[model samples]
Target: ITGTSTVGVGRGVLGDQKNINTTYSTYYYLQDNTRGNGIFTYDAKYRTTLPGSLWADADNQFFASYDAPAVDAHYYAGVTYDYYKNVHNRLSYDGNNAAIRSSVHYSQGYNNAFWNGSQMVYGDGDGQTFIPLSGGIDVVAHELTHAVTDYTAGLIYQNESGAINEAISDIFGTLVEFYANKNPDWEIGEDVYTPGISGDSLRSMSDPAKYGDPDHYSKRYTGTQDNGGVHINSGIINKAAYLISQGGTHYGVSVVGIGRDKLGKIFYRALTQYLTPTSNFSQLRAAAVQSATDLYGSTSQEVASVKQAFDAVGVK
Candidate 1:
């Protein structure tokens, strides 16, 4: 809807107050046109309707108790958009000016979020498991990066390829969190996951095994659950990515830190220029090596670090 951009103040799921950009035309809507095309947030109203009605407020003030999910969903979408454009020079998920849309309060007591091939969707978690997921910036960015992978690598969402797809989201999602300086860490969903639990997360990139996720290929799950353990096995690649950015010794293997910027450059290059829908972990290692060579020369420490990180995770 056409409207004037306006500022709205609100509290997010975690009780943090922040200002969000919205649109006003009679009723204020959760629409901000400040970045790549635009960022629009909608209310699912605890139902299944996608991108439900645009959240409208009477006075352009969104600080009511019930407005938490919508506020974070809208605000975090903008931040994720900024992360892509500023850090990678990518306009949007498609590397073009694409409108970003998110629907929050997706279902009653829903416990998950996903990129449904076109837009981002979030659930208001069951009180025991999570709060509104968008409050976790990494969760928001993780789903959005799925769209990014869809447009670039087109990694199939199954088997090793799916694990790669999942890890790509986790990698960039963590980077975006660090980009925003929001109490950043390598743990995914730490902010809004298990509100009752103080220090657990959905997954840990630094040590995925802490959450029952495999940190090495030998422990990879090959069963038919979770799209061939897409979520479970992603920890292997996640560990590799972590080791590349912040090197470590794991399972008797060692890696030298190459820093996040170079790690991001190498992975982005691989995603956009080298990976395919069926590319597996071994292929990812080759792509990362080639990408590092293209960016910093084959003899560069960046290339060596990339290889050692994958090897440390037993990627081959």
Candidate 2:
């Protein structure tokens, strides 16, 4: 969130007739986790950019649980913006192009949301298992994180690389939920959807092994169903990253991640700074391990542990 610019005629203290200071002051507008603006430029992030309650009621025209879509959107927008700023040192979703623009209410009973290259969009639920997508911090983080993925790695959203792309967002989205001080163990979208159908989300980062239909990934892990199961198979990488950060064995092998906050940070760094558009499981594992090694050392436990965790999940 820290960036500076110098334009023609300099940039600072714009006022006519008043000789308040000389040299135009070489103005340096500071943008933290909050926002930025200028006489000729703007870096703005808002909870809503379209008609609706923004976060509070962005989808409220349909759902019932969340009467405060705007509040939820703002909370997570702040979380998403801070995720880029603190974890990755990214100025915004695009890394320098501009600030993130999010729209919480995309359509009535929309059921899902996504980032269309530049902005994040939301949807109202069908008044069943979920309310609005923005009701959960992870959901908002998920969409905005898509922007991060698009801006950084540009991971193709179709096959293996596509699955990895989606998984990275879930990893950060889930972590941002926990980072927002939500609760224990960090389950994805626990706040957005309901227990009516099943408290279990479409996927679970904490226990992905429990949801698989086959001995390995879901029988429908690939193919055309479920959008190439990007959200479904994403559980593999998401859970792997989580376990690596947590540092322990869950269902089977150990993929321990150290220091909750630090784990999230390392993954974010790997996603934004290391990987490329076509990166797959092995590539991701190497990038994360390398990031850890560069930050710590070749002999650092974090480097070894992250590599093992990803490998345990068949990333090798």
Candidate 3:
């Protein structure tokens, strides 16, 4: 919708007050024109439709309980966009400033979120398993990172390649959470995963086995379920990533911490330049090693840590 760029005050699903970019014509719409082409958010209205309706408010104030999801979706999309642009120098998910879009309240008790190859969609959850998913910055960033992966590596979402894809999202999602400086941790979807539970999350990067996920390649799930255990097997890569960023010892293997910035740089470079659609765990190790070598030299500790991290995860 063509309208003047404006700002609106809103409360997110977590009840945090923030300002969101809006477009104003006859009414305020959740179409932010300040970033890229624009950041558009929509209301799914508990339906299964794509994009649904452009969220509009009579006033530029969004504080209603029903508006919380949209508020978080729109606001967090902007945050994720800023993370890419500022941290990685990428314009957007596509590196060409593609307009980011999201839809909230996707269905009744949907309890999940995903990137539908075109845009982001968030489920409201059953109030037991989850709340509004967009409320979690990591969740929003994880879904949007899928868009980034789709545009870049184009990693086929199955088997080893799929697990790498999932881990890439988790890695960047955690990085974005740290970038936002909001109680950052190596946990995925902790904020919105279970409103009734505490000290729990969907997955743990620091300790994937905490949630019964395999932290070693030998223990990787070989079953055909979940697109060859894409989510289940991602733990191997996630653990390696955690080791790279924060040093840890696992199964007699020790990795020297290279810190998060260097970890992100190596992975981002690998994702954009080396990873392929069919790259497996071994290939990912080579890519990360090569990426670290490129950014920090072959003799740098960054490269050494990359090798050690993969070794710690039994990738090689």
Candidate 4:
């Protein structure tokens, strides 16, 4: 359909009003002409398939109850794109303007979301647990950051490297959330997880132990489940990241705060340049050290903070 650039107003899954980019041809399509090549959102309806309808709306506005998931998926993708391009100067997940694509309402009562090594997939949760995964910006950024990791570090998704992979997603996802400043906190999926429960989140960067996740290397999981606790052990790194950004003490370990911008700079550089597929937590510490050194010099406090942050988390 030959379309013209247009604006869309809609309610997201969380019942928030937001404007989205759309294309108007014979009808309004959920396509945005923003970053990368284009941003596309599809509706899975109620079955499992690849790329459902190219979401269409009437009069270039979307306020229907059914259009909620599509609204957030589309709008959040645009925000994620803006975060990457504006903050990191990176074009897209591939470092070139690659098309951003997503599918919402993936399956009935599905309760999760993922990057799938290719594109993003979102699920409408079993009402009691979640509303729609895309309703949370941190969730969206976390999954998409997996794609970024795939393109850059290619961190093999298992064992120590896999834990590193998961941590990177959590780290950047939290960063993107902070960048957007939407009810910002060092928590992941707080906006969408267990809606009936307040002050509860799927994971916590500030204190992962609240959710039974390890915050110190000594407590790291050794089980083979969840790809060797990729999600479970990421909390250790998450804590280190939190310490770097907010400054805190755990187990008699103290770290000087360096703030979020420098923290993001150090981690992003380590992720894109220094880290590799087999890098473990110790290697990760070194990568972060070198990255901080590159940005703030070997003798700089930022580099010292990076080292202290990791050491505080028992990652030494």
TM values, all candidates: 0.98, 0.75, 0.99, 0.98
Q: How would you encode candidate 2's per-residue C-alpha lDDT over 1-316 as one tens digit per residue?
A: 2233321211111111111101122332211223332111111223234432212111113123332443355445766677667766777676663654555455656677677775666666666766666667788888878887887888888766787887887777877777676553456776657647555766677677566622223232757865676666777777677677776764476755587776876777787788888887678888888888878889988888887777567667
Comparing candidate 1 with candidate 2, which one achieves the higher TM-score?
1
Query: Which candidate leads the pack in lDDT?
Result: 3
Residue 161, candidate 2: alpha-carbon lDDT: 79
Tell me model 4's lDDT, rounded to 2 decimals: 0.90
Residues 74-157, candidate 4: write the lDDT tens digits.
Answer: 988889899889999999899999988899989899999988776888999999898899999999999989999999999999
Task: Report the lDDT tens digits of candidate 1 across residue range 1-98.
Answer: 99898898888988989999988899988898788788888889889988798888898777776799989988988888898888889999999979
Give a tens-digit lDDT track for model 3, residues 21-59: 999999999998989999999999999988899999999
- Rank order (by lDDT, best first): 3, 1, 4, 2
Error of model 4, residue 170, in angstroms: 1.1
Error of 4 at 161 (Å): 0.9
Model 4 is weakest, by summed lDDT over 10 consecutive residues, at: 57-66
